[PDB]
């Protein structure tokens, strides 16, 4: 059997991952799985950032003015 | 405050002993707050089970990759030992 992984997040998303000696192969497969996971999570972050406007600035902008 | 981004990793070794040992030798000490990131691991028969829980994807990415590195190291070592 191959190494596998399953991911779950509260926005309703479920994601399955599936990708010389037996153990040698095992280790390369884990390296490939690790890249899949990293690729997938990075993509999730890239879309979460794109879903914002610029309101990091604007958020702090109010806190300052409220101080003044 | 919620650990609801989860990932489970399942790693099939050749024997029940190899997985038991893997588990014993895996000693995660993350740099991440326990409030943000948690890892549980165990074995069943020849399979190692590692369950991550995290508050978000950023924390998860950092935590999972690092532990996977440890696991690979343990697989390399076992590869060396079983072939002599």
């Amino acid at each position: 059997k191959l190494p596998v992984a399953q991911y779950s997040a509260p926005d309703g998303v479920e994601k399955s991952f599936a990708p010389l000696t037996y153990l040698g192969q095992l280790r390369t497969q884990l390296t490939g799985l690790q890249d899949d996971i990293n690729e997938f999570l990075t993509g999730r972050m890239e879309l979460a950032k794109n879903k914002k406007k610029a309101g990091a600035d604007e958020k702090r902008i109010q806190e300052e003015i409220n101080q003044l | 405050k919620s650990l609801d981004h989860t990932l489970e990793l399942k790693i099939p070794f050749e024997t029940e002993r190899q997985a038991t040992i893997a588990t014993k030798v895996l000693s995660p000490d993350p740099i991440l707050k326990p409030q943000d990131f948690q890892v549980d691991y165990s074995s069943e028969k020849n399979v190692m089970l590692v369950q991550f829980r995290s508050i978000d994807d950023r924390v998860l990415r950092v935590g999972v990759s690092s532990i996977i590195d440890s696991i690979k190291t343990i697989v390399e070592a076992m590869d060396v030992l079983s072939h002599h």
Side-chain angles (χ1 to χ4, degrees), chain A residues 1-13 15-24 26 28-38 40-45 47-48 50 54-57 61 65-68, chain B residues 2-13 15 18-32 34-44 46-60 62-75 77-84:
Chain A
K1 282 287 160 53
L2 313 162
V4 299
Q6 174 70 39
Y7 165 92
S8 181
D11 60 335
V13 167
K15 163 65 165 158
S16 302
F17 302 91
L20 199 57
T21 57
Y22 178 96
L23 292 163
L26 174 52
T28 53
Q29 286 158 343
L30 284 175
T31 291
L33 203 55
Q34 181 179 36
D35 290 352
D36 296 343
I37 287 156
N38 270 331
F40 173 80
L41 289 171
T42 298
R44 297 263 296 166
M45 278 166 281
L47 289 175
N50 294 8
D57 195 92
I61 292 205
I65 278 179
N66 193 235
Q67 314 275 27
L68 309 149
Chain B
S2 324
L3 289 172
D4 56 6
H5 290 71
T6 65
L7 188 150
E8 164 149 70
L9 180 62
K10 319 187 166 72
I11 296 134
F13 286 88
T15 69
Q18 276 185 352
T20 284
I21 278 164
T23 284
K24 287 191 198 131
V25 160
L26 183 76
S27 288
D29 186 5
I31 47 168
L32 299 160
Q35 300 65 9
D36 286 0
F37 179 79
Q38 254 156 62
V39 60
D40 293 331
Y41 54 92
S42 66
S43 61
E44 198 42 58
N46 71 298
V47 183
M48 183 195 213
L49 308 172
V50 190
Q51 180 60 68
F52 310 84
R53 305 188 278 292
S54 182
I55 57 166
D56 71 34
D57 283 332
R58 174 199 179 198
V59 172
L60 195 68
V62 172
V64 178
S65 195
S66 156
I67 291 188
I68 291 181
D69 277 341
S70 286
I71 293 170
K72 290 188 301 177
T73 298
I74 294 165
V75 174
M78 259 169 191
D79 197 1
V80 165
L81 289 176
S82 52
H83 289 99
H84 299 82

